[PDB]
Amino acid sequence: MPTRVIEDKMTPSFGIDDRIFLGEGLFETIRVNSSKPSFAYMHWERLGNSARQLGIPFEISFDDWFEHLIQKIQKDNLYHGGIKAILSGGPASRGLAERGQVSQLIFQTFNYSIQKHPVRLISINWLRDKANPLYQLKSVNYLEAIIAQRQAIAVGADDALFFNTENHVTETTCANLFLIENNILYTPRVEDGILPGITRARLISHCQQHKMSVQEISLTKKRIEDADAVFLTNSLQGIRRVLSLDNIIFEVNHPIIDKLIFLLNQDES
Amino acid sequence: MPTRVIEDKMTPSFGIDDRIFLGEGLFETIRVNSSKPSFAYMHWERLGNSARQLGIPFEISFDDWFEHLIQKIQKDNLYHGGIKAILSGGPASRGLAERGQVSQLIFQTFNYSIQKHPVRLISINWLRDKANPLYQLKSVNYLEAIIAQRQAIAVGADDALFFNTENHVTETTCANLFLIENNILYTPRVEDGILPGITRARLISHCQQHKMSVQEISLTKKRIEDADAVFLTNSLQGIRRVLSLDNIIFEVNHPIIDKLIFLLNQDE
Known part of the structure; x- marks a missing residue:
């Protein structure tokens, strides 16, 4: 399956062979209000449209995306704050025009x-x-x-x-x-x-x-x-x-x- | 010491709070021929000049830099190939204009x-x-x-x-x-x-x-x-x-x- 969420096991990050280090990465910054992600759909839509344009797989359904946001908010006890989603091109062989077969997604919460x-x-x-x-x-x-x-x-x-x-x-x-x-x-x-x-x-x-x-x-x-x-x-x-x-x-x-x-x-x- | 080399412990990487994920990172790609890095000084000079322009700390002497290159060549059995050095702005609090107090440096070898x-x-x-x-x-x-x-x-x-x-x-x-x-x-x-x-x-x-x-x-x-x-x-x-x-x-x-x-x- 060509999109992987990297989960906490403690904060996750991207490996040094990830194409995100060449700039092949996208993000969304999502407001969280009263423990609910604001406009989660529109953020998913835009991220997916951009991924498609760059040839980066984004095989995560909206429902799974939303569920991931909720699980992060709940785990980190967020009420008001933000969540940043980062999608990397993923691990790949060396070369500027190589293609990551599996993209990687990380979610992080913050207060501001x-x-x-x-x-x-x-x-x-x-x-x-x-x-x-x-x-x-x-x-x-x-x-x-x-x-x-x-x-x-x-x-x-x-x-x-x-x-x-x-x-x-x-x-x-x-x-x-x-x-x-x-x-x-x-x-x-x-x-x-x-x-x-x-x-x-x-x-x-x-x-x-x-x-x-x-x-x-x-x-x-x-x-x-x-x-x-x-x-x-x-x-x-x-x-x-x-x-x-x-x-x-x-x-x-x-x-x-x-x-x-x-x-x-x-x-x- | 405001510049830290991240060593193998195997392969190292940058944490999710590192400003490299905002694009605050620099690199050098150094050719290696018969186990000797080519123009190591010119590569160090450029990276340092750029780090200074961006306000990223680069407190590594040329001798230290060269020693890191040779150690990595040896450890990886590199004879002909390349070494990529990546210098990140480093971990910092949230905000686009925040500043990494300690920059991070990672070296990786490759054949090509x-x-x-x-x-x-x-x-x-x-x-x-x-x-x-x-x-x-x-x-x-x-x-x-x-x-x-x-x-x-x-x-x-x-x-x-x-x-x-x-x-x-x-x-x-x-x-x-x-x-x-x-x-x-x-x-x-x-x-x-x-x-x-x-x-x-x-x-x-x-x-x-x-x-x-x-x-x-x-x-x-x-x-x-x-x-x-x-x-x-x-x-x-x-x-x-x-x-x-x-x-x-x-x-x-x-x-x-x-x-x-x-x-x-x-x-x-």
Whole structure:
């Protein structure tokens, strides 16, 4: 059977012959609320879609996936917190284009605090090609993000914002970006070369259900600078308000943001 | 001691809290010939330079490094083959900008096969910014290269050639590139966003020593399309001849290539 969960016997890890050491690995970071994994299906779907694209087996049913998440939450006594799933290409013979016959999955829980202070961003100087497939995969290849976040921290900021080679905004090191102008929501298109976030997707669905105008379009730096508000989304933090980008301070409050926080919070899927 | 070697106790690995699983890892691939590692110093120097750039501790002296290599060669009965050194950021608390207090170093030996057939390359469609620091580091973040290599194999090619956002050649998935035009050697500049190869640097040195004109300059796709010959360099395979890039076919012979193979082989 071509996908193996590595269980505790005490924390599991990947062996040195695993292709995850060449970067052949994917992850999902799942919020746990009241001992229940939030949006377990959407995380499974995305992980499987990405695995398929990379040729990595992902032969674990949704029910078994969900059961594994529950057994981890129960064993580690988690109520609120997170679970990270890491899928490796697996042990394989040496060679860049070799193929792991059996992929390996590890689950790990953690506890963390939701940060409520608004975030300070800096723009990164190097650009991404929207055609580079790496940027639509939640992979283990995060050094770029690490370097960018360290630069942000070095200059007094919290996180870094990337742009593509058409000078359009994509995302930060860990979150999708939204802005609000004249009570209309804007966010970069999937085609701008972003990670298609689950939280982003949920927020768009909520807006559609509530007939709140939301536009998926290519956004220049000037659009951000001129926004009424700017905020970020991800599964662990939900919506995070943005105080500034480079030398531009924003108002952090908006009724649309409070409404969206409420709606994301009520979701028990 | 902020750098720990993980020894056999048999095979060692990194723990799940290690920042290597976020991509914070560097490597060196060292050729071994008749039980002797090749250019151990240049490999140590590069890894140290990169670790310093990333803030990963690398408190291992060259003598210590060399001793580790020889001990591993001996223990594994390695005569001809390779040694891969992997340096991880190490265990750390959760967070993307957290820092490993103690980096971890693991050495592994392997046999490998020498491939001498002239290679067929394809050009990759997505471009890299030369200002993206990733591309000058020999890191564990090789998924881009994996995807590219798989595309090359799908159409019966051997390797894939990357370009930067100024439409200049950089490197392949595993090797630097050189071209010959009118008996002059040309190779992309380090500033074009390439890994500064050891084999590349050795070749530049041999050319200088033998009065061979060698130009480190930005190269367009057209320059390569018009080249007399094209070849690749890395530690394990040495000089590799190039038969084709996309639909463009090259003569694989050139007197300069023969001379350079001779000169690099004394060293190996």
